[model samples]
Target: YAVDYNEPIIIKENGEIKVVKIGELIDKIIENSENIRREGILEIAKCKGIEVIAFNSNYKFKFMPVSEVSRHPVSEMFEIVVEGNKKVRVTRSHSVFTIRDNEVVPIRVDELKVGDILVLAKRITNIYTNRKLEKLINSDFIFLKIKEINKVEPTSGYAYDLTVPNAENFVAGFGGFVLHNA
Candidate 1:
């Protein structure tokens, strides 16, 4: 005797449409697997008298005071150590902040004063295996020579220009791009 197999069918026998929740599917798969986790850390060092400069190809320059720079958790816990007149050591966490559909808050350098530092950090846990993420944070600090500081029309922000001729060339040599009309 021969046996016949019936084909699988998904039918809308009633009025409403059939739907499946994504979370339910994920939960079912996770129940059958073993997971493992890993952690990583990163560090950034800042030194005293170290200057944070902002510039564009047009020679515009602005300096960031030390006070505006420090380490803080945006989503995770991190450590920061201020050493030597202008140096700081930062220990970073393994997780990152998800900015999905969120607006980024701008950093106000003008409000910063001498000896101020700013730091941001975040943490993530309970992530599934087979997923990988980079947790290292690195920054290359640059200081610009102040040619002059001028008060401009009582504006709300501070702006200045680089004192060095061909400052754009120097920045390009450092693998940086010059901003148009900057």
Candidate 2:
């Protein structure tokens, strides 16, 4: 578990930037980590890319319903201002998803880490022939199991043009994969 010297890391906080290395984050994450009473370190919330999956931690991965994910501007951010027992607010601005049980479920690229699994379906081309529309085949209904996510690259300028509303229900992306996990 080592990072190359050229690798990037978060050394900034509270809208401030500074030079820091990945090595130092271990302590910082621990420092900011909540000190739960009997539960000990409940979890580490700060950090990215890497997920702290506990040993023999067998949990079947599943994707939440696409509609279950609430989409917004990737907007600014806000968090709770819990007081005594009341759900408090700063009386001002911000946009953010409500966190649950110490985590916010994600369907976005940024929030997904290297080891996440995805169930992806391929695109089907339904041709409108000389007189009517052609029938879809069994191949069109079968979705392949994507074992893990590698990279998510944005589409070219003409990309999104082919999906949704224009070609409704199309998934846009450029994902690269090289598998070894058998």
Candidate 3:
């Protein structure tokens, strides 16, 4: 795991600048993070499957909703927060379709290192553009599977965007796949 060191920057109103210890910066960041999480949860108490995108690199990912279980098939954008060049956290507004609380286990980006996590809410909805296909699909949990990964040069203004291939048909209907112990 690579250790991310954050250099503290102190800027005075009078234009004075100073460098503080990394420990001090981390303490303040942690405190602010807690407050943000609390406020986020309160704002999205009525939402459901909302997910925050936490990443180690400066990139943006698009979340595509599967209609196998729900009716909404839309893609949303998200970005990860960086702490001194190291991607640390992702904070975003909650969505009605996804129940994103301060819960859900965080996933490590690199197998060798532990990374930050994002909080999200998820929800279910009804209404599909394809009326005929909607009738064939059943109501159940939607499982998102990563189909492909594309590497692109980082842009100057924003991070890279992730494209989901054939996102509409890839998602499985609710309670479709399950594992059984023998």
Candidate 4:
């Protein structure tokens, strides 16, 4: 009950910028993971040393270690389309970052309405920039207004989630959107 499998996740590996599918990333990490478990329809594990682009409470981007990853069966999903035609698929109960009262906070996917704004990377078109690796100096982010939200049933019954210790959030999707872990 989280993000869909094909969603693109922005990551920094050995100082190199890359964008990979959330499911593929989880599969790689799970292979070497030490703690793997299956709880009902959910399969999860502790994934160490993998760094993903995440933001602090202040909305500053940096490489944060991935503490855990999981996948679980889900029926329905919300396809959120933001400005620039950027899109992401998440379960109803999953949390996504949005601005409210001048503060960035997590809101449930089902609670998001059209015209709501979401935080995302300014631009990661080039791979040479180290902005997404270490603590970023010049903040590279933007707030995109939600264009539409649609309900869809995915053929793949599973959804993925990543637990990122301090920053509980990671940048994913075609637009490098920000979302919280379940």
Residue 159 of candidate 3: its Cα lDDT? 15
Model 1 TM-score relative to the real fold: 0.15
- Give the TM-score of each candidate: 0.15, 0.19, 0.16, 0.64
Candidate 4: which stretches are off by over 4 Å?
12-17, 31-34, 57-60, 82-84, 95-107, 111-147, 176-182
Greater TM-score among 1 and 4 belongs to 4
The lDDT of each candidate is 0.21, 0.22, 0.22, 0.69
**Pairs in steric clash, model 2:** none
lDDT tens per residue, model 2, 79-117: 122112111111112111223345432233234333334
From the highest TM-score down, the ranking of the candidates is 4, 2, 3, 1
**Span of ten consecutive residues with least summed lDDT in model 4:** 126-135
For model 3, residues 1-182, the per-residue Cα lDDT tens digits are 00012212222212333344322333333344422222321210111222211111222222332111111111222223222222221112211121125433323222112133322112221111111222133334442332222222222111111112232211111112111111
Q: What digit string (tens of lDDT, one per residue) describes model 4 on residues 1-182?
A: 26677777788765677888777887776776778899887788986557887666566667888777888878888889988888777677666668877877777778889988887656652111212332243547688999999999864677877777776556666555544444
**Model with the higher lDDT, candidate 1 or 2:** 2
Judge candidate 4 against the unseen true structure and give its global Cα lDDT, from 0 to 1: 0.69
State which candidate, 1 or 3, has the greater lDDT.
3
The residue-by-residue lDDT of candidate 1 on 34-106, one tens digit each, is 4312222211122222122323234344332211111111221122112222221111212212222342222
